[PDB]
Amino acid sequence: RLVLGAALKEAISNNQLKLVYQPQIFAETGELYGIEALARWHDPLHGHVPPSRFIPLAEEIGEIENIGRWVIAEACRQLAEWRSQNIHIPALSVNLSALHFRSNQLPNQVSDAMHAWGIDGHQLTVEITESMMMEHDTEIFKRIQILRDMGVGLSVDDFGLPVTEIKIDKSFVDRCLTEKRILALLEAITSIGQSLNLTVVAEGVETKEQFEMLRKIHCRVIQGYFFSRPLPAEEIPGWMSSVLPLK
Structure with missing residues (x-):
């Protein structure tokens, strides 16, 4: 704004x-499925600023220009830096909806990042919401198909068909324990994923009780506080070396 x-x-x-x-951790095995990359911003004043606070506030250089382009660059930088000691990671997810990617004129930044750093492709996954589904005919899915040719998976958020992953919002995970009909509604989503081999992931899993619930309705992967909070890059390999699997 005036200064920041x-x-x-x-x-x-x-x-x-x-x-x-x-x-992101498998349900039955407890093995690591993937990891979601979350952008952060630290400042000498006002401390750490979550993406829920600075991304809408960015209105000069980047709304898509420098925000989302740096995230994929660092993520790919970190993948190679991690590969230097261990391949380990099956896949890494990047939220495009949260980074306000919305503009659809720059898919090249993701491709070039896969070129600048080693291999990638199937180790990447892009995340968009319903608000970004069609967007008044901007040929989004036409450019997403280009990304699918590289091996990069597609992920849908919330929503409680060229997709590869379906994410379940925390608000729906909360209502499943008290309302068994919205549980059956999620059991419908996990039926689609189990039949069409689509990875259904559940966000915001806090307690043990709701994990056992997702466990018996056959939800593939769990993401939330039950396993681990978002962790910095420097202590990720140690976390996998220490406590993994968590069964």
């Missing part, structure tokens, strides 16, 4: 723009 708008403008050049990573 220029500060966020120089987040790449002020040595404090980072990414945090949240682990």
